[PDB]
Design an enzyme around this catalytic site. Structure first.
Site, PDB file in Angstrom:
ATOM      1  CG  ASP A 103      -2.004  -1.247   1.480  1.00 51.98           C
ATOM      2  OD1 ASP A 103      -2.127  -2.205   1.089  1.00 51.98           O
ATOM      3  OD2 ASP A 103      -2.854  -0.584   1.932  1.00 51.98           O
ATOM      4  CE  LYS A 168      -4.454   2.770   3.503  1.00 46.85           C
ATOM      5  NZ  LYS A 168      -3.756   1.445   4.587  1.00 46.85           N
ATOM      6  CE  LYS A 202      -6.055  -1.179   3.352  1.00 51.11           C
ATOM      7  NZ  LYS A 202      -4.632  -1.915   3.577  1.00 51.11           N
TER       8      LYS A 202
HETATM    9  C1  HPD Z   1      -3.211   1.438   5.225  1.00 46.97           C
HETATM   10  O1  HPD Z   1      -2.009   0.296   5.592  1.00 46.97           O
HETATM   11  C2  HPD Z   1      -3.435   2.356   6.397  1.00 46.97           C
HETATM   12  C3  HPD Z   1      -4.250   1.925   7.546  1.00 46.97           C
HETATM   13  O2  HPD Z   1      -5.310   1.209   6.779  1.00 46.97           O
HETATM   14  C4  HPD Z   1      -5.103   2.389   8.442  1.00 46.97           C
HETATM   15  O3  HPD Z   1      -3.525   3.365   8.984  1.00 46.97           O
HETATM   16  C5  HPD Z   1      -5.702   2.482   9.533  1.00 46.97           C
HETATM   17  O4  HPD Z   1      -6.343   3.691  10.231  1.00 46.97           O
HETATM   18  P1  HPD Z   1      -6.538   2.955  11.986  1.00 46.97           P
HETATM   19  O5  HPD Z   1      -7.946   2.111  12.123  1.00 46.97           O
HETATM   20  O6  HPD Z   1      -5.540   3.102  12.307  1.00 46.97           O
HETATM   21  O7  HPD Z   1      -7.612   4.837  12.193  1.00 46.97           O
END
Ligand code: HPD
Length: 252
Positions: A103, A168, A202
């Site tokens: 990502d 995402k 995502k």
């Molecule tokens: C990409 O891996 C980013 C992650 O999805 C986020 O950092 C998750 O956010 P939180 O659930 O910790 O707010």
């Protein structure tokens, strides 16, 4: 008795990229996360951890008999700088550590300053490396920083054109992360480009409750029908959602 919220919560669990991305992370915390991903009702789709923790996570997932839980990681993160050589180096290292998925953060500030080319070139370079290694690439556009619908759409479009396998919303590391509106805009880009088959979505950052997750699947189901959101096309990025889903399911 089945309910809409139980149905959505089990789906969301199975689509989760269960995450820990903290400065204080340790092997012990990553091992615990791997154990958490193996739930009484099924496994999450993936975990998402910093690259250095991939080998110990792989070992842990194997030893508990869930080698099919994918390992995602992050690069160019969280800042989304516009140095392609650095983003690519990080991506190549993530691949070498053993990532299944990367990502990468899009250079959103560069786009806000009028440079569309650097985001194309950055995503394309990282996609080339990932594709050669059979690694999926997700692109984080940082909707909360882009803010304007046109910019969200353009970052999404550029990312798709450059080869993103997922788009995402957010890093989770800025003040505003996933919102239902941002999710709708990004999914509308997938629709408008006709890339439903090849590009997933995502939502990430601040998705904390079973009701939160339900709102995002409601939009996916509206736009693409209820069969579209499988693990190749939908993930929840979440560090602190799983306990809420398990509670909704009576297993928490
Ligand atoms: C990409 O891996 C980013 C992650 O999805 C986020 O950092 C998750 O956010 P939180 O659930 O910790 O707010």
């Amino acid at each position: 008795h089945m309910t809409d919220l139980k149905a959505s919560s089990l789906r969301a669990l199975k689509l989760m990229d269960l995450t820990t991305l903290n400065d204080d992370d340790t092997d012990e915390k990553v091992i615990a996360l791997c154990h958490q991903a193996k739930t009484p009702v099924g496994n999450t789709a993936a975990i998402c951890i910093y690259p250095r923790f991939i080998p110990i996570a792989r070992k842990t997932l194997k030893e508990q008999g869930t080698p099919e839980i994918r390992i995602a990681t992050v690069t160019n993160f969280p800042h989304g700088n516009d140095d392609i050589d650095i983003a690519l180096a990080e991506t190549r290292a993530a691949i070498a550590y053993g990532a299944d998925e990367v990502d990468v953060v899009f250079p959103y500030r560069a786009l806000m300053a009028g440079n569309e080319q650097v985001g194309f070139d950055l995503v394309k370079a990282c996609k080339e490396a990932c594709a050669a290694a059979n690694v999926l690439l997700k692109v984080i556009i940082e909707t909360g920083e882009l803010k304007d619908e046109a910019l969200i759409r353009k970052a999404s479009e550029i990312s798709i054109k450059a080869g993103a396998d997922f788009i995402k919303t957010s890093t989770g590391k800025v003040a505003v992360n996933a919102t239902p509106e941002s999710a709708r805009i990004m999914m509308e880009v997938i629709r408008d480009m006709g890339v439903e088959k090849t590009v997933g979505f995502k939502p990430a950052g601040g998705v904390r409750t079973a009701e939160d997750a339900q709102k995002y699947l409601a939009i996916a189901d509206e736009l693409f029908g209820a069969d579209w959101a499988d693990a190749r096309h939908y993930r929840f990025g979440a560090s602190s959602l799983l306990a809420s889903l398990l509670k909704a399911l009576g297993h928490g």
